Amino acid sequence: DIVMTQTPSSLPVSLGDQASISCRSSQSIVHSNGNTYLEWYLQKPGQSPKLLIYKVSNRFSGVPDRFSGSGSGTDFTLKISRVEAEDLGIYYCFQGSLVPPTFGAGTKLELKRGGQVQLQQSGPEDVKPGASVKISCKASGYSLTTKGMGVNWVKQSPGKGLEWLAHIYWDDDKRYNPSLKSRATLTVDKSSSTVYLELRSLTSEDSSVYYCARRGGSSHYYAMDYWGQGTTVTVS
């Protein structure tokens, strides 16, 4: 039960303007074993979440030279010295450390006007409430049974922000989210390397778009580097 502070959700800027976001945590996110796992993500309006930063200060590959996780203690922040075209989008701060992980409500970065490895997910599922559904996440480009890597699951309810659900390690140990009331049960087909997530007795609040996410190796300090396309679930 870790609540990540919202921080300046609305962030208008002109181009080339300096940009800085913050993140603050209720309790200490410093994990037993002494590492603090904090990650920063970007979501384009149409796109899937994109990992900007892994383990606070450190940053992901393919990410432009100017970004800084400045995080220290329970206080965290991300700075962009120069803003360009594709840098626009909405940002989330995420902690992968204590118990049930959580995101921030996220920050909207919008222009002020004036003047390989691939993951694949199942199709959309539309079904009456009270029913049960199962979706697929198929991974290619690596071995799911490799040590250090596991598969997470993320749901995005529009306007309700981002939410974490379940995770399955390579050693098959599964942990779910307590708020799910342990309705969900993970499954994995090792032959075709597809990971299944089943949800029992659906309700209206369970209607959302669900994402498949890979916890990276220890080199990435267990961050979500590669994401699914997402699958969309709705109830009647």
Side-chain angles (χ1 to χ4, degrees), residues 1-97 100-236:
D1 39 52
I2 301 285
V3 279
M4 313 298 292
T5 314
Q6 149 227 23
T7 69
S9 156
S10 64
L11 192 60
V13 277
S14 197
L15 301 179
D17 256 329
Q18 205 248 6
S20 65
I21 312 187
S22 157
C23 191
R24 187 168 305 105
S25 74
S26 36
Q27 289 84 3
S28 291
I29 317 300
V30 53
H31 180 30
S32 63
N33 95 321
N35 267 117
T36 87
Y37 307 118
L38 179 102
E39 308 153 17
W40 287 89
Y41 295 85
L42 170 151
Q43 181 177 15
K44 284 295 193 174
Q47 277 282 39
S48 57
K50 182 182 149 52
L51 169 76
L52 254 56
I53 264 180
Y54 75 116
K55 201 250 181 278
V56 203
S57 41
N58 296 66
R59 90 188 141 206
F60 191 64
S61 173
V63 170
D65 53 333
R66 26 85 193 171
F67 293 103
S68 48
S70 286
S72 91
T74 187
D75 172 273
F76 308 87
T77 165
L78 173 56
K79 302 190 303 178
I80 321 179
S81 57
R82 180 126 55 182
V83 177
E84 297 175 6
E86 93 154 14
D87 289 341
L88 274 95
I90 88 179
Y91 295 94
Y92 292 99
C93 82
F94 168 67
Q95 63 90 3
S97 299
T102 38
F103 304 87
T107 290
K108 305 182 181 179
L109 181 72
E110 63 185 326
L111 167 62
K112 38 179 173 183
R113 199 47 182 94
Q116 268 287 10
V117 183
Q118 284 182 343
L119 283 82
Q120 319 199 11
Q121 292 199 207
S122 155
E125 307 264 42
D126 29 25
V127 73
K128 297 178 159 183
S132 319
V133 301
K134 170 186 298 183
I135 51 177
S136 70
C137 187
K138 183 171 184 175
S140 41
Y142 73 97
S143 171
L144 165 66
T145 46
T146 197
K147 310 189 184 64
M149 288 184 199
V151 164
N152 234 321
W153 280 92
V154 151
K155 135 188 157 176
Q156 172 182 291
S157 290
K160 306 262 175 198
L162 210 52
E163 218 170 315
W164 176 92
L165 305 181
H167 161 272
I168 167 185
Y169 225 164
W170 60 264
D171 79 280
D172 287 40
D173 173 74
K174 319 100 161 292
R175 313 204 65 176
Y176 303 118
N177 194 295
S179 51
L180 271 267
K181 301 303 181 179
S182 188
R183 298 183 303 188
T185 48
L186 282 170
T187 323
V188 49
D189 170 83
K190 308 195 179 159
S191 64
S192 51
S193 69
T194 65
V195 184
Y196 299 144
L197 171 55
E198 183 184 11
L199 249 187
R200 301 181 173 198
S201 73
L202 293 188
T203 88
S204 182
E205 303 111 8
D206 297 31
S207 297
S208 163
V209 39
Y210 295 72
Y211 281 88
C212 189
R214 174 190 97 152
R215 291 233 306 186
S218 199
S219 52
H220 285 139
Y221 283 143
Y222 321 130
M224 309 170 182
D225 37 345
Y226 296 118
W227 289 67
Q229 39 187 157
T231 195
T232 327
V233 175
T234 52
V235 310
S236 174

